[PDB]
Every structure is written in C-alpha cells, then in structure tokens.
C-alpha cells in the first residue's frame, strides 16, 4: 500500500459526507446506495464512522461534474480519468468529484459507481496508489470482479489500518 506525504490523516473518527448533486445516469437511490456501500467497506476495517449531512459543509463533499468544474483539474470527457479525490484536510480536502461524461451504472455495463467511489474514498482517507495488483487502491482496479465477488484485499486493510487502527476492541 502507499500512504501520502507527511501522512495527511483525518484527526477525528467521525466524518460527515454530503452528496451535492445527482447524475442523470442513475436513479437517486442507486447513487445513494453505491456511496453508502463504498463508505462501509472502509468502516468495516477501521474505527471510522460516517454520517450524512443534507446541508452545510461535510468533510467529504461528493459531486458529479464535467470538464472544468471549479478546481484546477478539469475532467476530460469520456473515459480515461473517471473521478478524482483530495487527500485528508479542510475545505476541498477529502472531497471527491466524479466525471459525468462517464456512464455511471449499478452493474458492469458502464462505469460502476460503487467501485470507483470506494477507490476514491480510499484517497479521501489517505491511501495513495498501491503496487499490489489485487488491491482496490491499485491504479487499474477498474479491471477487478465486482460483487459477484468483491472483498478488500489484505493490502488495502493493512494500509488503512496503518493509518487509523483496527476496528474498536
């Protein structure tokens, strides 16, 4: 696993998230379930807990965007960059932006929102890219078998627990 420079880490266990807008690609409930599942794979293996804010500024602001959308890193249209996220910290840090020039799907016929979201929240909690091919944080994870089979790899668990510790016990 790789952890970011000078170890940007959330200095608290309870983090809030806020879904700012909704893709036309999916029902709103499907966007909601994919982000909840993405958050729960990391919750399961750390003492971190998350809750949802509907207004105000949450730690992890989630939004769908196309091309230039307000930060210095515009999206590129179809394919290639699918989403990006900032490492822990205040303001735009911890936030995750999803490229809506992708076709976000519940399954594998397009770009699977669960899997890209779970990868991206790994960056939001402080994981960088793994050299380990079977890891969710490996750059090419989008070529991995989704919840027909999905499980976090030992490497991702080792990485997130080197930052926040194991589940409370």
Catalytic amino acids? 120
The pattern of x and - marking residues 7 through 46 that bind Zn ion according to CB under 5 A reads ----------------------------------------
Q: Which is nearer to Ca ion, 94 or 153 (CB)?
A: 94
The CA–CA distances, whole Å, from 161 to 43, 83, 88, 132 equal: 11, 24, 15, 16
* 34, 70 contact by CB (below 8 A): no
Place of tokens 């879904």: 19
Within a 10 A sphere around the Cβ of 128, how many other Cβ atoms? 14
CB of 151 vs Ca ion, minimal distance in Å:
27
CB of 155 vs Ca ion, minimal distance in Å:
26
Binding-residue total with Zn ion (CB under 5 A) = 2
Piece of the chain touching Zn ion by CB under 5 A; list 47-55, 92-100, 101-109, 154-162? 92-100
Residue 76 interacting with Zn ion (CB under 5 A): no
């Amino acid at each position: 696993f790789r952890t970011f420079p000078g170890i940007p880490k959330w200095r608290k266990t309870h983090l809030t998230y806020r879904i700012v807008n909704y893709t036309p690609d999916l029902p709103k409930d499907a966007v909601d379930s994919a982000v909840e599942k993405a958050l729960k794979v990391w919750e399961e293996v750390t003492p971190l807990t998350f809750s949802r804010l509907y207004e105000g500024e949450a730690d992890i602001m989630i939004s769908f965007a196309v091309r230039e959308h307000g930060d210095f890193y515009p999206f590129d249209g179809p394919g290639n960059v699918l989403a990006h996220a900032y490492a822990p910290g205040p303001g735009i840090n911890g936030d995750a932006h999803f490229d809506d020039d992708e076709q976000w799907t519940k399954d594998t016929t397009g770009t699977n929102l669960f899997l890209v979201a779970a990868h991206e929240i790994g960056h939001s909690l402080g994981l960088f890219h793994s050299a380990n091919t079977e890891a969710l944080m490996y750059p090419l994870y989008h070529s991995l078998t989704d919840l027909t089979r999905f499980r976090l790899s030992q490497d991702d668990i080792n990485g997130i627990q080197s930052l926040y510790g194991p589940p409370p016990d």
